[PDB]
UniProtKB/TrEMBL annotation, chain A:
Annotated compartments: Bacterial flagellum; Secreted
Family per record: Belongs to the flagella basal body rod proteins family.
Residue ranges constituting the Flagellar basal-body/hook protein C-terminal domain according to the UniProt record: 5-48
Organism superkingdom: Bacteria
UniProt name for this protein: Flagellar hook-associated protein 1
Automatic annotation (TrEMBL), chain B:
Name of the protein in its database record: Flagellin
Family indicated by similarity: Belongs to the bacterial flagellin family.
Compartments it resides in: Secreted; Bacterial flagellum
Protein purpose: Flagellin is the subunit protein which polymerizes to form the filaments of bacterial flagella.
Length: 50, 50
């Protein structure tokens, strides 16, 4: 029991749930998608110099 | 509103894990072969038995 309870600590950031979040990260790839669209908007911007 | 969607990510793991723990708890009764093994389950019965 002392092992089990103190095995709980996680100390540093560990993986039980932290492991779950990894699959989620891809969502930012969608966030990056917009950032590219912002650059596409620069086409509209400099198009106005042309 | 916003944080809620992200925490269901947290919650479901908690929910399934808890069910796993209850499954684990049942398995401990298999190991014990007893209704309880301490007082934090039922002291009255625990004491009643004594």
């Amino acid at each position: 029991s002392v092992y089990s309870e103190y095995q709980s600590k996680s100390g540093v950031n560990t993986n039980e749930e932290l492991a779950a979040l990894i699959q989620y990260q891809s969502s930012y790839g969608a966030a990056a998608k917009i950032v590219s669209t912002v650059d596409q908007m620069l086409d509209t911007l400099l198009g106005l110099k042309s | 509103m916003r944080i809620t969607n992200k925490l269901n990510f947290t919650n479901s793991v908690n929910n399934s894990m808890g069910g796993q723990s209850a499954l684990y708890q049942i398995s401990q009764q298999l190991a014990s072969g007893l209704k309880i093994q301490n007082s934090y389950e039922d002291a009255s019965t625990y004491i009643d038995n004594t």
